[PDB]
Amino acid sequence: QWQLVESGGGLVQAGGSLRLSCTASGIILSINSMGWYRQTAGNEREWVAFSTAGGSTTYADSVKGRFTISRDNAKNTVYLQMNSLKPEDTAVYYCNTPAGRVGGTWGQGTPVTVSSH
Amino acid sequence: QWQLVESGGGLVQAGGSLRLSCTASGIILSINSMGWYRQTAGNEREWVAFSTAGGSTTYADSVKGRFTISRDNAKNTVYLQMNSLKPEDTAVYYCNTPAGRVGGTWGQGTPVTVSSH
Amino acid sequence: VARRQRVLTITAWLAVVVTGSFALMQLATGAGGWYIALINVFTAVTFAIVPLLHRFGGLVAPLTFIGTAYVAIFAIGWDVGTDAGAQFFFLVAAALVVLLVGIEHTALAVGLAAVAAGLVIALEFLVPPDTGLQPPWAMSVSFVLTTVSACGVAVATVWFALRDTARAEAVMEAEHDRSEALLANMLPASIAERLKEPERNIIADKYDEASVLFADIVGFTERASSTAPADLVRFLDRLYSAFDELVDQHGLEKIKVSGDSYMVVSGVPRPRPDHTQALADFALDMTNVAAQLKDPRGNPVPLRVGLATGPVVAGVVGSRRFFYDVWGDAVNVASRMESTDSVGQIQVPDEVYERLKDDFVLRERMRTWYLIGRKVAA
Amino acid sequence: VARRQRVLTITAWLAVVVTGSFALMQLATGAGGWYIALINVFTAVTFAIVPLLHRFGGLVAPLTFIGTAYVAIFAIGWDVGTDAGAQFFFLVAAALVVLLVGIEHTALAVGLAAVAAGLVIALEFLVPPDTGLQPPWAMSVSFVLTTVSACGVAVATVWFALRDTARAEAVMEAEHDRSEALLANMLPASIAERLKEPERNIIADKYDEASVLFADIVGFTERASSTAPADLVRFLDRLYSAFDELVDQHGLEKIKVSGDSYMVVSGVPRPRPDHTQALADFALDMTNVAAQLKDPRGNPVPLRVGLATGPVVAGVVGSRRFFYDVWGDAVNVASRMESTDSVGQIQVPDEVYERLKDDFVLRERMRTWYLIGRKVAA
Ligand SMILES: CNc1ccccc1C(=O)O[C@H]1[C@@H](O)[C@H](n2cnc3c(=O)[nH]c(N)nc32)O[C@@H]1COP(=O)(O)OP(=O)(O)OP(=O)(O)O
Ligand SMILES: CNc1ccccc1C(=O)O[C@H]1[C@@H](O)[C@H](n2cnc3c(=O)[nH]c(N)nc32)O[C@@H]1COP(=O)(O)OP(=O)(O)OP(=O)(O)O
Ligand SMILES: [Mn+2]
Ligand SMILES: [Mn+2]
């Protein structure tokens, strides 16, 4: 079963911090890239972070400097540090490889909400 | 002697009208294009009018609608009607084919001055 | 003609507000007399007319409005006492006129201001002070209303002018920002500044090391024979959009897309020690993505991929229709490799094999070596 | 932050001018007394200080300047008579404050204006009229100076603000115009509007007839072997600049320039009945120009030219690095012809021969027919 499950989302206030986790079964992460996308509703799902096999990382302009993507090869996991959160980042975050991205085969994602409560 | 001689220039007032003549010896005009350029000094010589073999004509943006290029095949000549003249058009006007243009081989041109006297 | 429209809008609203103010004074007045009423009708009618007749021509109309204002106000002030408040309106108008008229006529505007001042020094002296026409208490109420109106007219007109300016600025900024975004998209920022400058200089940049990847489709003509051209262009657009997303997502740069051919270049804008490794990983990901995708026919779309490395030259060429471009021996090498590559395979020369063997798997078959993939072990 | 700078500049110049005005009143005064002098020193010092202390933070500083102005003017007006002219300065300030403060605080600004008015109605009544302190004639001169200063301060400040706005607008316009000119140069205008729109739609345009010309260099690699790359790029730029001038001068459009290859397309943006004839004439002129030109080696540069005609498809492709492009069978035909063309010759197929024989000369040698030139007779 080639699957990816996300976790770590929840409720926070503006300016808080989160760590989203993505664990995949059915592939080897060392030889595959990874990317974190976010979906709000006003658009279809856009890529905010990307980590290649080899350590290179890239981020979207709206999110550079606040979010950090890292890997844990033994656990077969990818982690997204989120800092200095803003209301614009409230979304459902997803994790994939490019093949799954263009094939449309995803998991259920993880919700992240930025508001005061 | 492949030569082109220009004529018809002189002194006029703003808003006047001129007809510059270009007669060439050594080629057949029906099978060769023709172009009228102007030189002021603030730039090197720029093309203001062009007539192809076949009747197609084109003009520069700064001069479209005021200047008209025509041919007279029996006389082996090209004529430039100039209308609604302005101080910006004071220059030395030259006539050539593209080959002579890129080869640097020209005649002496014809002077045109726009001012009140 | 935006400045002219701003001036005309502010003067029209000014006329409307002043007529509105004058009507209240006229209605409130009781037992004041008819001699003043005759002048009042003339003033109100002319003030209402001038906005409707603004298009006669030239700057004479706004000046005529001010001439009428000055004459009417002087005439009303002379008869009534000084305490009514004719002085205050002159001071408002002195500051207001400069804003009303454009910069080109500032000198004239200044004169008008002086003229107003010339009247004020006279108005206190020449005019008979405290002349009483019918009820004085209405005169005191007139003073209060004069103060309030003098403040309000200026406040409203200045705010309206500032609002119009801000609106124009916002529209300007949005319109410019869209074009700037497009230009930034379709060329690198650093070279864009060079292109913008009026001075023309040939752009040539020498780069010691770089790597180039060429990808092409196989049997595209056969696919074209059985499909409508319009659908074929759409298929190409879909494929290249996916590839462009992957390229941006790896960080590499793509110079151009000519028909079936797709060209990628690594490290030209900024050199890096590990350009070749990144290019190889990108090529593997590209092959996987291309394999997954499906065409309208339903047959898989194979891609031939050839990689090369070496020094390169970058810069635009020509005097029209510019685009970044790249040049060097590596381009010739890559073109040859891609041309001779087998279906669904990636090929590289011996020189690239010298670099990539350490961190990548190259096997089988100038002599070349197929690029199978990355090392599983880590 | 341009708006903030505008506000700060106008307030600083306002402070300077008001201090300059106040100094003259202080120097002119004779035998006025010391009680007023004590207040005058305080007012002048605070007015001079506030511009130097403008960077403490927030909008409280410009409001403090106005608080000081109001307090000082009220204090001086109370002691002296009403005829001095304290009333006029309030009216100037009422209109001036709205301009001084930004739009975001307009409501507050309005309140300030009302406050000024609230004082004026009081100032005439509450203040003791015609209170005489030492010489009255100096008081009358003070009234005259008050009128002149009240006019001049407003005139100067308004003109300065308008000047700053016009300067900003001019710089804005030049900066935007340069980018717009570049964008217009590097793509047709009609498609640029489509590209600018946020909504993304695939651009496909079907054209019934068009003609394409391909030109290429022969033995470019051999020339490259004996020349430095940097000089080679310069030579290419010179050649393509000349060709671009000729193309613009005939009116045809060029889509792109890939290395040695030069591509021209006729009639795509606007159909015409005589596209093929124009393309043939342009090709003849291009061959002559290329023959005349000289390369660094000194050897002539031959060019292989192939022409084709047929329906085409136009539009951009991809999601990044857009350019106009063209597609169709005619492109394949032209590429094949150009590839198989002999050195220093122009080749066309039978179909083009069907059209061009009437007005052009085609001779010798799917079957093709060399394009020798135009008919001498007319
Ligand atoms: C009916 N033909 C088409 C209809 C719609 C869209 C495209 C085409 C088409 O024919 O595309 C071909 C060229 O026009 C188009 N093309 C080639 N050069 C150009 C070019 O320079 N400009 C444009 N706009 N299109 C070009 O590429 C495509 C493939 O030609 P190649 O020379 O690359 O060879 P191949 O068929 O892929 O086989 P192989 O190389 O694997 O052996
Ligand atoms: C040492 N090589 C160069 C140094 C400086 C500038 C250019 C070159 C150079 O090699 O240019 C060649 C390609 O890089 C360059 N080139 C080809 N494709 C591309 C391309 O896709 N992009 C860029 N930037 N350059 C390209 O074209 C040029 C000629 O290659 P062709 O495939 O067109 O064949 P040919 O040598 O002209 O002979 P023939 O076609 O008449 O039989
Ligand atoms: Mn191809
Ligand atoms: Mn070539």
Short mmCIF file of N, CA and C in Angstrom, two decimals, chain D residues 290-370:
data_model
loop_
_atom_site.label_atom_id
_atom_site.label_comp_id
_atom_site.label_asym_id
_atom_site.label_seq_id
_atom_site.Cartn_x
_atom_site.Cartn_y
_atom_site.Cartn_z
N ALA D 290 23.14 39.00 -46.81
CA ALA D 290 24.04 38.03 -46.20
C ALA D 290 25.30 37.86 -47.03
N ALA D 291 25.15 37.83 -48.36
CA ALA D 291 26.32 37.71 -49.22
C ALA D 291 27.26 38.89 -49.03
N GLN D 292 26.71 40.10 -48.93
CA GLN D 292 27.57 41.28 -48.81
C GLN D 292 28.36 41.27 -47.50
N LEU D 293 27.72 40.88 -46.40
CA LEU D 293 28.35 40.98 -45.09
C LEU D 293 29.57 40.08 -44.99
N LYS D 294 30.48 40.45 -44.08
CA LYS D 294 31.76 39.77 -43.91
C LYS D 294 31.92 39.33 -42.46
N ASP D 295 32.49 38.14 -42.27
CA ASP D 295 32.73 37.59 -40.94
C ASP D 295 34.15 37.89 -40.49
N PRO D 296 34.46 37.63 -39.21
CA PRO D 296 35.83 37.90 -38.74
C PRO D 296 36.90 37.15 -39.51
N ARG D 297 36.62 35.90 -39.90
CA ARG D 297 37.60 35.13 -40.66
C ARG D 297 37.87 35.77 -42.02
N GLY D 298 36.88 36.47 -42.57
CA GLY D 298 36.98 37.03 -43.90
C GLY D 298 36.35 36.17 -44.98
N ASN D 299 36.08 34.90 -44.69
CA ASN D 299 35.38 34.06 -45.64
C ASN D 299 33.92 34.51 -45.74
N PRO D 300 33.29 34.38 -46.91
CA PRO D 300 31.86 34.68 -46.99
C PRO D 300 31.06 33.69 -46.16
N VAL D 301 29.92 34.16 -45.66
CA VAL D 301 29.01 33.33 -44.87
C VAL D 301 27.86 32.91 -45.78
N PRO D 302 27.81 31.65 -46.24
CA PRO D 302 26.66 31.21 -47.02
C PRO D 302 25.48 30.89 -46.12
N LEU D 303 24.28 30.97 -46.69
CA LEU D 303 23.06 30.70 -45.96
C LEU D 303 22.17 29.79 -46.79
N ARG D 304 21.61 28.77 -46.16
CA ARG D 304 20.63 27.89 -46.79
C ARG D 304 19.24 28.35 -46.38
N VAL D 305 18.37 28.54 -47.36
CA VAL D 305 17.05 29.12 -47.15
C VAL D 305 15.99 28.20 -47.76
N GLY D 306 15.02 27.84 -46.94
CA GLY D 306 13.89 27.05 -47.41
C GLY D 306 12.58 27.71 -47.04
N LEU D 307 11.64 27.71 -47.99
CA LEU D 307 10.35 28.34 -47.77
C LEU D 307 9.23 27.31 -47.86
N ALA D 308 8.18 27.52 -47.08
CA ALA D 308 7.01 26.65 -47.09
C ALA D 308 5.77 27.48 -46.83
N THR D 309 4.61 26.91 -47.14
CA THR D 309 3.33 27.59 -46.95
C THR D 309 2.26 26.58 -46.55
N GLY D 310 1.23 27.08 -45.88
CA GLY D 310 0.12 26.27 -45.45
C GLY D 310 -0.56 26.83 -44.21
N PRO D 311 -1.59 26.13 -43.73
CA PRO D 311 -2.26 26.57 -42.49
C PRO D 311 -1.35 26.39 -41.29
N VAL D 312 -1.57 27.22 -40.26
CA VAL D 312 -0.72 27.19 -39.08
C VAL D 312 -1.55 27.42 -37.82
N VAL D 313 -0.94 27.10 -36.68
CA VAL D 313 -1.52 27.32 -35.36
C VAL D 313 -0.55 28.19 -34.58
N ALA D 314 -1.08 29.20 -33.90
CA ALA D 314 -0.27 30.15 -33.15
C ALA D 314 -0.77 30.23 -31.71
N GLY D 315 0.14 30.58 -30.82
CA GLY D 315 -0.18 30.74 -29.41
C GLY D 315 0.98 30.31 -28.54
N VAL D 316 0.94 30.73 -27.28
CA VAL D 316 1.98 30.39 -26.32
C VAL D 316 1.74 28.99 -25.80
N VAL D 317 2.76 28.43 -25.14
CA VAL D 317 2.69 27.10 -24.56
C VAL D 317 3.53 27.09 -23.29
N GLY D 318 3.10 26.28 -22.32
CA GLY D 318 3.76 26.21 -21.04
C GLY D 318 3.15 27.16 -20.02
N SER D 319 3.70 27.10 -18.81
CA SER D 319 3.31 28.01 -17.74
C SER D 319 4.43 28.96 -17.34
N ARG D 320 5.56 28.94 -18.04
CA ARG D 320 6.69 29.79 -17.70
C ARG D 320 7.51 30.03 -18.96
N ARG D 321 8.12 31.21 -19.02
CA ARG D 321 8.99 31.58 -20.13
C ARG D 321 8.24 31.52 -21.46
N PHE D 322 7.22 32.36 -21.58
CA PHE D 322 6.34 32.35 -22.74
C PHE D 322 7.01 33.02 -23.94
N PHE D 323 6.61 32.58 -25.13
CA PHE D 323 6.93 33.28 -26.37
C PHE D 323 6.01 32.76 -27.47
N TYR D 324 5.83 33.60 -28.50
CA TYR D 324 4.63 33.53 -29.33
C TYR D 324 4.46 32.17 -29.98
N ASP D 325 5.51 31.66 -30.63
CA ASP D 325 5.48 30.35 -31.27
C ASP D 325 4.56 30.27 -32.48
N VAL D 326 4.68 29.17 -33.22
CA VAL D 326 3.82 28.86 -34.35
C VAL D 326 3.92 27.36 -34.58
N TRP D 327 2.90 26.78 -35.20
CA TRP D 327 2.88 25.35 -35.45
C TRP D 327 2.11 25.04 -36.72
N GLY D 328 2.40 23.89 -37.30
CA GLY D 328 1.69 23.43 -38.47
C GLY D 328 2.58 22.54 -39.32
N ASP D 329 1.97 21.99 -40.37
CA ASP D 329 2.71 21.16 -41.31
C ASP D 329 3.74 21.98 -42.08
N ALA D 330 3.41 23.25 -42.35
CA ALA D 330 4.32 24.11 -43.10
C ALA D 330 5.68 24.20 -42.41
N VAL D 331 5.70 24.15 -41.08
CA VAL D 331 6.96 24.21 -40.35
C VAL D 331 7.81 22.97 -40.65
N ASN D 332 7.19 21.79 -40.62
CA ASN D 332 7.91 20.57 -40.97
C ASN D 332 8.44 20.65 -42.39
N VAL D 333 7.60 21.10 -43.32
CA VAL D 333 8.04 21.22 -44.71
C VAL D 333 9.25 22.15 -44.79
N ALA D 334 9.15 23.33 -44.17
CA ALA D 334 10.23 24.30 -44.26
C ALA D 334 11.51 23.76 -43.65
N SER D 335 11.41 23.07 -42.52
CA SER D 335 12.60 22.49 -41.90
C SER D 335 13.26 21.49 -42.84
N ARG D 336 12.47 20.60 -43.45
CA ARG D 336 13.05 19.63 -44.37
C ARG D 336 13.72 20.32 -45.55
N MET D 337 13.02 21.27 -46.18
CA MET D 337 13.60 21.99 -47.31
C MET D 337 14.91 22.66 -46.92
N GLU D 338 14.90 23.43 -45.83
CA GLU D 338 16.12 24.11 -45.42
C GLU D 338 17.24 23.12 -45.17
N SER D 339 16.93 21.98 -44.56
CA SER D 339 17.97 20.99 -44.30
C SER D 339 18.57 20.47 -45.60
N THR D 340 17.75 20.24 -46.62
CA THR D 340 18.24 19.69 -47.88
C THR D 340 18.65 20.75 -48.89
N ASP D 341 18.61 22.03 -48.53
CA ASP D 341 18.94 23.08 -49.49
C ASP D 341 20.44 23.14 -49.73
N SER D 342 20.82 23.49 -50.96
CA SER D 342 22.21 23.66 -51.31
C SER D 342 22.74 25.00 -50.80
N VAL D 343 24.06 25.12 -50.78
CA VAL D 343 24.69 26.34 -50.27
C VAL D 343 24.37 27.51 -51.18
N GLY D 344 23.99 28.63 -50.58
CA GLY D 344 23.72 29.84 -51.34
C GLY D 344 22.57 29.70 -52.31
N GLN D 345 21.47 29.08 -51.89
CA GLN D 345 20.32 28.88 -52.75
C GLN D 345 19.05 28.88 -51.90
N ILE D 346 17.92 29.13 -52.56
CA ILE D 346 16.61 29.16 -51.92
C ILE D 346 15.76 28.07 -52.56
N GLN D 347 15.16 27.22 -51.73
CA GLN D 347 14.36 26.11 -52.25
C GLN D 347 12.93 26.16 -51.73
N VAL D 348 12.01 25.74 -52.60
CA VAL D 348 10.57 25.75 -52.34
C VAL D 348 9.93 24.51 -52.97
N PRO D 349 8.77 24.08 -52.48
CA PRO D 349 8.12 22.89 -53.02
C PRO D 349 7.31 23.20 -54.27
N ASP D 350 6.63 22.16 -54.76
CA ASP D 350 5.77 22.31 -55.93
C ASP D 350 4.58 23.22 -55.63
N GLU D 351 4.02 23.10 -54.43
CA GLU D 351 2.84 23.90 -54.09
C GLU D 351 3.16 25.39 -54.12
N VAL D 352 4.30 25.78 -53.54
CA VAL D 352 4.72 27.18 -53.59
C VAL D 352 5.04 27.58 -55.02
N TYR D 353 5.61 26.66 -55.79
CA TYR D 353 5.87 26.92 -57.20
C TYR D 353 4.58 27.23 -57.95
N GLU D 354 3.47 26.62 -57.53
CA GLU D 354 2.20 26.90 -58.18
C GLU D 354 1.81 28.36 -58.02
N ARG D 355 2.16 28.96 -56.88
CA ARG D 355 1.75 30.33 -56.60
C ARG D 355 2.75 31.34 -57.16
N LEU D 356 4.05 31.07 -57.00
CA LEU D 356 5.05 32.10 -57.24
C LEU D 356 5.52 32.17 -58.69
N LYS D 357 5.13 31.22 -59.55
CA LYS D 357 5.64 31.26 -60.92
C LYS D 357 5.17 32.51 -61.64
N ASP D 358 3.97 32.99 -61.32
CA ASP D 358 3.38 34.09 -62.07
C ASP D 358 4.20 35.36 -61.94
N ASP D 359 4.69 35.66 -60.74
CA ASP D 359 5.38 36.91 -60.46
C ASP D 359 6.85 36.73 -60.11
N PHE D 360 7.36 35.50 -60.09
CA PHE D 360 8.75 35.25 -59.72
C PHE D 360 9.32 34.18 -60.63
N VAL D 361 10.65 34.06 -60.60
CA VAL D 361 11.37 33.12 -61.45
C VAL D 361 11.82 31.95 -60.58
N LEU D 362 11.32 30.76 -60.89
CA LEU D 362 11.74 29.52 -60.26
C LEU D 362 12.20 28.55 -61.33
N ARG D 363 13.36 27.94 -61.12
CA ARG D 363 13.99 27.10 -62.12
C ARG D 363 14.72 25.93 -61.48
N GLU D 364 15.06 24.96 -62.33
CA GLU D 364 15.90 23.80 -62.03
C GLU D 364 15.38 22.96 -60.86
N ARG D 365 15.97 21.77 -60.69
CA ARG D 365 15.49 20.74 -59.77
C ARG D 365 14.00 20.86 -59.48
N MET D 366 9.61 14.78 -52.16
CA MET D 366 8.77 15.55 -53.07
C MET D 366 9.62 16.39 -54.01
N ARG D 367 9.04 16.79 -55.14
CA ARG D 367 9.77 17.59 -56.11
C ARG D 367 9.77 19.06 -55.70
N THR D 368 10.91 19.72 -55.90
CA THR D 368 11.11 21.11 -55.52
C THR D 368 11.51 21.91 -56.75
N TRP D 369 11.68 23.22 -56.56
CA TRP D 369 12.02 24.12 -57.66
C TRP D 369 12.79 25.30 -57.09
N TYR D 370 14.06 25.46 -57.47
CA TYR D 370 14.86 26.53 -56.89
C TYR D 370 14.22 27.88 -57.21
#
